[PDB]
Amino acid sequence: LVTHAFDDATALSFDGRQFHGQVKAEYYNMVGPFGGITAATMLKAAMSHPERLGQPLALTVNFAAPAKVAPFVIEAVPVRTNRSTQHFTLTMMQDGEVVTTATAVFGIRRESWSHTEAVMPDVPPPADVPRFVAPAPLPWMQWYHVRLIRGSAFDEVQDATTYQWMRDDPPRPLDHAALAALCDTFVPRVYVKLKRPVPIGTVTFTVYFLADPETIFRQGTNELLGVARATGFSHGYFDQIGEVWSQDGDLLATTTQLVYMKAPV
Amino acid sequence: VTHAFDDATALSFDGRQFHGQVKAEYYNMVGPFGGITAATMLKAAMSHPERLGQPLALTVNFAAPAKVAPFVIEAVPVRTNRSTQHFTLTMMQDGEVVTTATAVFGIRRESWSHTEAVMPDVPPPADVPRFVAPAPLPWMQWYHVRLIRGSAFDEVQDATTYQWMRDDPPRPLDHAALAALCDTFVPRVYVKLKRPVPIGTVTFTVYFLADPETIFRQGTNELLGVARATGFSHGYFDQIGEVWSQDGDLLATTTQLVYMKAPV
Ligand SMILES: [Cl-]
Ligand SMILES: [Cl-]
Ligand SMILES: [Cl-]
């Protein structure tokens, strides 16, 4: 029996009222844990809830304050339940104070007419792209295999747009929470733009899972292509818009991020 | 004489909760209007005794379409930090939850600025005629929309809409108003399929990227909305949007996630 780190970080227990977990120090980022893991964690809670029906649709996580690397507690309410659809409200506490909050939508979906409006960019295969290793690694970075295509802080690239191949490392089958996490695996837009770091932190993170659950699972350990772009940077904040595609060209999820930023003049 | 929007979002604090009334003037055929609903949620947080700072972000989930009736809202300032604060809000009609939301307040400080995305080149409001829809919903009489691109009547082959928008009759722009304006877009799915289908918004998000001083300066003027979609599969599609001042200032961005009935 071997535990994958991810399943290890997001491991929870239910006492019948609240969920218990530990912030893993191995997922640390700066000034608190990697956002994607915290969000994946926020999602399992509702997923592991007994009342929970259907599969995930959307997730919005708001980081109220950087989580200590401590045990924490999550209280996940099945706030509304309808035929095909379900809404959750979640709260994570450490030492009696609110650390993180999230809302989620679960639902049972059936097949419809489908089309894909966005274009998948034309890119080389994971074969041709070399894995990218940062000179100063972040603890959680070790948990992902990223082949960077364009858009880094080392690039000559003058816009904010990033392309990357990414998967869990070591390889892990794909599911919803893992997928949420992969959406915070993007280098902060602002670094990409300035080629040097500034202090930043994420206030809020949203993710929509566009692909039906079956499609998502289909990927198994196959690598994925993320695309993160930025919109603007003003008066202390900026935003990240991003998409995640299957190697086949199927659009898996879309995400947005609102991020505090410290750059003065 | 008060303004309808201001009538719709008017709330009274009993010391614990907020009390307001869904108003039919704002009805949408399916249930009430998302934007008005969303606005009220934020109005709650701003109106809270404990509010600190100005709006940053808001996400709203519609658990169930609200009936036209009185409601209460529990707005909770879940954490209050030095420079930043977070709310969780719950609208309830008859003890069953209708709507929830999470808001972020905080302070905008002078800092570095660049804007990455390109505001499209479009005709000024003047040279675009106001588009009045053939079958209007009650909430529609409260907005003035000049439609440049992307309608269900258009010849367009994609999901992308450009338009000019402001409240009618005019009211000085504020955060709540701004939020509402983001639900103004014809659902992406009409635009592509060039025909109306059943839809609903499960979830909606507005980031406010312009500092408050910038938002307020807009005052009474028309804004450019820009809305697109990434994809449609298995009952849902999404909507991405941007809101620009005329000066080329980026004000907000939005995402919406939307139900659809579209069998093969
Ligand atoms: Cl964080
Ligand atoms: Cl609650
Ligand atoms: Cl957004």
DSSP string, B58-122: EEEEESSPPPSSEEEEEEEEEEE-SSEEEEEEEEEETTEEEEEEEEEEE-------EE-SPPP--
Taking phi over 0 as left and psi of -120 to 50 as alpha, with beta for the rest, A83 belongs to alpha
Question: Which of B52, B206, B230, B247 would best serve as a mutation to test chain A binding (most A beta carbons within 10 A)?
Answer: B230
- Which residues of chain A lie closer than 8 angstroms to B188, CB-CB? 117
The 3-state DSSP class for residue B192 equals helix
- Alpha carbon distance A64, A68 (integer Å): 12
Residues, Cβ < 5 Å to ion ligand 1: A 32, 63, 201
Q: Considering every ligand atom, which ligand is closest to the CA of B252?
A: 3
Query: Please, are residues B190 and B198 in contact by the beta-carbon 8 Å criterion?
Result: no
Other Cβ atoms less than 10 A from the Cβ of B106: the count is 21
Q: Please give the resolution of this entry in Å, rounded to 1 decimal.
A: 2.8
First to last CA, chain B: 50
Question: Within 10 A of B158 (CB to CB), how many other CB atoms are there?
Answer: 14
d(CA B247, CA B249): 6
Of A112, A207, A225, A260, which to mutate for an interface test with B (greatest number of B Cβ within 10 Å)? Answer: A112
Helix (H, G, I), strand (E, B) or coil at A27: helix
Whether omega for the bond prior to residue B55 falls within 30 degrees of 0, making it cis, is no
- Chain B: give the shortest CA distance to residue A172, in Å: 25
* Shortest Cα–Cα distance, A140 to chain B (Å): 26
DSSP 3-state of B10: coil
The number of C-alpha atoms within 13 Å of A59 and in the hemisphere containing its C-beta is: 33
Q: How distant is the alpha carbon of residue B144 from its chain centre?
A: 15
Identify which of A60, A160, A236 has the shortest CB distance to residue B111: A236
Tally of CB atoms within 10 A around B225: 24
In sequence order, what DSSP letters do the residues of B106-174 get, joined into one string? E-------EE-SPPP----GGGS-B---SS--GGGGGEEEEEEE--SSS--SSS-EEEEEEESS-----
Query: Is the peptide bond prior to A264 cis by the omega test (within 30 degrees of 0)?
Result: no
The secondary structure of A97-138, three-state, reads: EEEEEEEEEEECCCCCCCEECCCCCCCCCCCCCCECCCCCCC
User: CB-based burial of residue B253 (10 Å sphere; 0-12 exposed, 13-18 middle, 19+ buried)?
Assistant: buried
CB atoms A114 and B234 under 8 Å: yes
Interface contact B202-A105, CB threshold 8 A: yes
Closest CA to A165 of A252, A229, A224: A224
Asked if the Cβ–Cβ distance from A105 to B235 is below 8 Å, we say no
Contact residues, chain A, for B253 at CB < 8 Å: 231, 239, 241, 256
Take residue B78 and report the two structure tokens written for it.
């879940």
Determine whether the interchain pair B235/A112 forms a contact, defined as Cβ–Cβ distance below 8 Å: yes
How far lies A184's CA from each of A2, A204, A228, B208, B240, in Å?
Answer: 25, 11, 10, 21, 19
Give Cβ neighbours of residue B62 (< 8 Å, ≥ 6 apart): B31, B34, B37, B98, B99, B200, B201, B202, B203, B204
The CA angle B224-B228-B231, to the nearest 5 degrees, is 170
Residue A165 vs residues A131, A135, A168, A253, B20: alpha-carbon distances, Å: 9, 19, 11, 15, 49
* Domains of chain B with CATH codes: 1-264 (2.40.160.210)
Cβ distance of A82 and B64 shorter than 8 Å: yes
Are A167 and A224 in contact by the 8 Å Cβ rule? The answer is yes
Search chain A and give the residue with CA nearest B160.
A117
For A110, the closest of B188, B228, B235 (CB atoms) is: B235
- Give B67 to chain A, closest Cα distance, Å: 15
Whether residues B116 and A160 touch (CB distance < 8 A) is answered with yes
